[PDB]
Design a protein around this ligand. Sequence first.
Ligand SMILES: NC(=O)c1ccc[n+]([C@@H]2O[C@H](COP(=O)([O-])OP(=O)(O)OC[C@H]3O[C@@H](n4cnc5c(N)ncnc54)[C@H](OP(=O)(O)O)[C@@H]3O)[C@@H](O)[C@H]2O)c1
Ligand SMILES: NC(=O)c1ccc[n+]([C@@H]2O[C@H](COP(=O)([O-])OP(=O)(O)OC[C@H]3O[C@@H](n4cnc5c(N)ncnc54)[C@H](OP(=O)(O)O)[C@@H]3O)[C@@H](O)[C@H]2O)c1
Ligand SMILES: NC(=O)c1ccc[n+]([C@@H]2O[C@H](COP(=O)([O-])OP(=O)(O)OC[C@H]3O[C@@H](n4cnc5c(N)ncnc54)[C@H](OP(=O)(O)O)[C@@H]3O)[C@@H](O)[C@H]2O)c1
Ligand SMILES: NC(=O)c1ccc[n+]([C@@H]2O[C@H](COP(=O)([O-])OP(=O)(O)OC[C@H]3O[C@@H](n4cnc5c(N)ncnc54)[C@H](OP(=O)(O)O)[C@@H]3O)[C@@H](O)[C@H]2O)c1
Lengths: 241, 241, 240, 235
Amino acid sequence: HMELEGLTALVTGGTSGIGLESARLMAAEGADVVITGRDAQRGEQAAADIGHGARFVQADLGDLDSVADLAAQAPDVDILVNNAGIYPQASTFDQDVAGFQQLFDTNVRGTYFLVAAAAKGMVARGHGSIVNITTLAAHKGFPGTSVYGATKAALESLTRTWAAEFGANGVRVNSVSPGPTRTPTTLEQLGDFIDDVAAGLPLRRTAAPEEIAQAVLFLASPRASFVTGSTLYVDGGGYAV
Amino acid sequence: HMELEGLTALVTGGTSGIGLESARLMAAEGADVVITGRDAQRGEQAAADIGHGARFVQADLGDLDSVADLAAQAPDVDILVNNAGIYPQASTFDQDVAGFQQLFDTNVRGTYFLVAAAAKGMVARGHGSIVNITTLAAHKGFPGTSVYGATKAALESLTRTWAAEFGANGVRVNSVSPGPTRTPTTLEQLGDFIDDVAAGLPLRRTAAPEEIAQAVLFLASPRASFVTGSTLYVDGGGYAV
Amino acid sequence: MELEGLTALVTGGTSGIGLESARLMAAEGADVVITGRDAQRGEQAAADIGHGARFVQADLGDLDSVADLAAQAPDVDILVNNAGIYPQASTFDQDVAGFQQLFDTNVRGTYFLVAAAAKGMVARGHGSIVNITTLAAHKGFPGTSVYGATKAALESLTRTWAAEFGANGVRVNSVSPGPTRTPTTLEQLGDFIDDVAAGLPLRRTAAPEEIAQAVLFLASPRASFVTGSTLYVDGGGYAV
Amino acid sequence: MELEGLTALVTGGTSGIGLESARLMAAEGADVVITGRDAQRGEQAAADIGHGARFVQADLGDLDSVADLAAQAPDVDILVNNAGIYPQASTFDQDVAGFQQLFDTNVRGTYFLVAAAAKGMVARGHGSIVNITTLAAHKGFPGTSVYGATKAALESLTRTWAAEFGANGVRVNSVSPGPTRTPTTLEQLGDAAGLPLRRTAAPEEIAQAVLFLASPRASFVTGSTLYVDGGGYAV
Ligand SMILES: NC(=O)c1ccc[n+]([C@@H]2O[C@H](COP(=O)([O-])OP(=O)(O)OC[C@H]3O[C@@H](n4cnc5c(N)ncnc54)[C@H](OP(=O)(O)O)[C@@H]3O)[C@@H](O)[C@H]2O)c1
Ligand SMILES: NC(=O)c1ccc[n+]([C@@H]2O[C@H](COP(=O)([O-])OP(=O)(O)OC[C@H]3O[C@@H](n4cnc5c(N)ncnc54)[C@H](OP(=O)(O)O)[C@@H]3O)[C@@H](O)[C@H]2O)c1
Ligand SMILES: NC(=O)c1ccc[n+]([C@@H]2O[C@H](COP(=O)([O-])OP(=O)(O)OC[C@H]3O[C@@H](n4cnc5c(N)ncnc54)[C@H](OP(=O)(O)O)[C@@H]3O)[C@@H](O)[C@H]2O)c1
Ligand SMILES: NC(=O)c1ccc[n+]([C@@H]2O[C@H](COP(=O)([O-])OP(=O)(O)OC[C@H]3O[C@@H](n4cnc5c(N)ncnc54)[C@H](OP(=O)(O)O)[C@@H]3O)[C@@H](O)[C@H]2O)c1
């Protein structure tokens, strides 16, 4: 239980759901974990549940000054899990401009400029692993998810460009594309949606967040030392059908 | 013999390059063609050279008020070609915030809300065809194209979602993903870049803009009556290698 | 007449998607050769098409027949690899003999016909090769395991051939169709294509003429910069 | 401890990627059965692996040998379809006999081994199948036409099998490796530079991907391709 000993791991949106479980797995493997989120009360609680010296830093990925402060507060990261993200739904005809801009500001812009800062240090040191959390709706057309799927699709392309830009200096970049997963947000907002998506999956069920974190752990760890530029689908068969 | 006789088409960025050749092919096929651009002088010259009653409407895809006024001036369209776009290059470490936001405003946001307006009439009438121009860098990792490829990969996802949302009402949606093409902008800005990309293509050459336009015409026309939600790669084999 | 002066060979050109592809190309001025196993159906198909289209009898599952076909039509500019069978069975039900027949017909016959015909294209410096695949080679449909695999092998062959022949100007592409109303899909698989169509954004099956239009495009000079790619003609099947 | 109580069958487990995959699983508590044609290397590989691992001789090109193999291990929880060959020749140079052997070995033998082993997995309601493919099945590399076609067929089978068996809890996935320093590859290549990582892989690096997909860690991963190729597919 020491495969990540000596590595610092930053997990955006790591105070709930898939981010919480990914930070838990990496702390248990000996990494020094930093998690971020907006709600300070819930972030400090999440860092205690995780234990192993995990610490919380408040940051809003939608504000670029906050992103730059986060990068300043963790200038030595070996594992970056870009997990923070929102996914409100609306048909194209119902979608508003302000919601469009917040989705791109949060899901794309904040992750882009955090990577620009953190990867520079990884490239200097000659080692690092970056994992971007995407979505099945970025690979198939589900009505109501045009904007959300478009943000994660841009992340899929960034995974490829970044892997080619940083690979010469030993830095790996990959995506984890999850299917419908039971998290507090999906339970509150999209309770029937995830169940409807699940009826069309081969495994015919939704995922526990731990099952998604297991794929994040693999790609972050040195077990995936030859894995870069790729997408790891964790969707119970959704992309296959 | 004019297969598009009776239809109205709107080509964004149709005053030079791939867009101008797509408009010329459609106007020759008997469609009533509207072309848009930012510079009014070169717009009127383009409309004049195209002939066949083609008209110009000035619009800036980056300004949403301008996009709204464009939708008003061309309300009922049967063919929409989303071709307008920009592609400046920079490494992820050199990329600036202003340039990031302009690339997404022009390539993604403007097309999104033009479609939201144009597709409403296509759905009500029960027929229509939308063609989105993407890029090879959205499917393979090219250093220096992180943002640009990310904007076009968002558009690839929108093609899938939109085809699922508008399909029941007869509206088709597809992408054309071009390889390196000789245009006014690539010959003045990316002269050595396109030949470098051409060297690793199975066809070992760059394309004329008309060669890209033939794919756009096919997808816009009743010949492609069963084609929707897909990408047509016109790239000399780049995606295959 | 876009295809004037060009010779086109269509395997399985006596019925269904192949028949309509040959009809389109003949109407474009091409000298079309259609092939099939049944001599009566072939002669009737050539008359139905017109335009000097001629029939040549061959069995793609027999390599001697394949070699005999390439000898009767040595100089082809357009080759449409359309002949194929698609019987359905779950993996637990699938028999050995049907497995071998599916690969013999759908893969081996096309491979060595391409090896023969593409030699002349490469030496002449031009040509277009269109391989007919299937949606089941891209998504998992129960009961189509062997069929999808043969067409997936064909998809990969498109990429390898595009790279090997592209230096000499020869293009290679795949057409991946959705459920199409041919006499075979109506006799057998009658309700399967309906179930598939209900899950497509267009919510319908295709007429064979609609698949043929994609074959015509990739085969013609209009697609001069298109090689190594898959053109999906499936009502949105791949996107959902 | 993670694979304790499970039985894993690795075809081509006496060398290269297969040997390292079977090694990782045995060291995780699985009862490992490896298979190959050569009996002397097979018994050595079984002793090399240790942990009670055993060797069963079989030729994937002979369906009677494949049937005998399945009957000697009817209770497999993990199946790694790793045996394969990859000779090269341009399309114009490819011979009929070599074409048929490539499909007989890489596709037919795997297909009917799966048809037997998946029955027990479906009955029990759990199991994991891992098919080893190749980058050449997704990109066009001159000289790999037949080899890549056989692996592309496996890629499609992964999806169909995921749909057919997933209705009863059985997962099926592909592992697509890049260039790897196995004994066959070192002899065939003699004297990679286009990959983002700019190096070839050690066999153990491919085996780690096999292990993850085979283990309960990947409990929600099915029908997918895991690319372990130094960035080849992305470029
Ligand atoms: N079904 C699924 O759950 C599913 C499926 C596919 C993909 N995904 C992807 O998986 C990722 C995580 O999913 P999830 O269900 O675990 O989400 P979640 O439970 O709602 O948690 C999201 C995390 O992101 C943080 N966050 C949200 N907006 C932020 C902002 N503007 N700045 C900084 N942090 C912000 C939240 O912290 P605060 O509450 O303090 O703001 C929270 O810690 C997302 O990117 C999602 O797109 C999820
Ligand atoms: N090698 C290639 O050329 C290549 C390869 C792959 C993909 N593509 C894609 O193909 C499309 C066209 O490429 P191209 O080379 O033909 O471009 P181009 O020659 O430079 O022409 C661009 C057109 O878009 C218009 N435009 C630019 N910015 C605009 C804005 N903010 N608002 C409204 N109109 C705007 C321009 O009008 P004004 O001149 O008046 O500003 C012009 O008519 C682009 O979307 C590009 O991403 C090109
Ligand atoms: N729904 C669909 O129809 C659909 C969907 C996706 C893909 N496809 C693919 O599209 C292609 C054509 O489909 P289709 O429905 O139009 O087929 P079809 O109507 O049943 O006709 C098949 C053609 O192939 C010939 N053929 C069959 N076996 C042959 C052999 N061993 N050697 C030589 N010729 C042979 C037949 O002629 P003879 O009978 O006289 O031998 C016939 O001309 C097939 O490759 C199929 O896999 C079809
Ligand atoms: N660079 C790479 O090495 C590379 C790259 C991409 C994909 N792959 C894939 O990875 C897999 C393993 O690669 P590898 O380099 O480790 O191969 P390898 O070292 O040559 O070992 C192949 C194994 O398959 C067995 N085998 C061969 N033919 C057989 C047959 N007819 N029946 C039964 N067993 C048979 C061999 O046993 P015997 O010696 O006793 O016959 C041996 O154990 C292959 O499927 C290959 O396609 C490899």
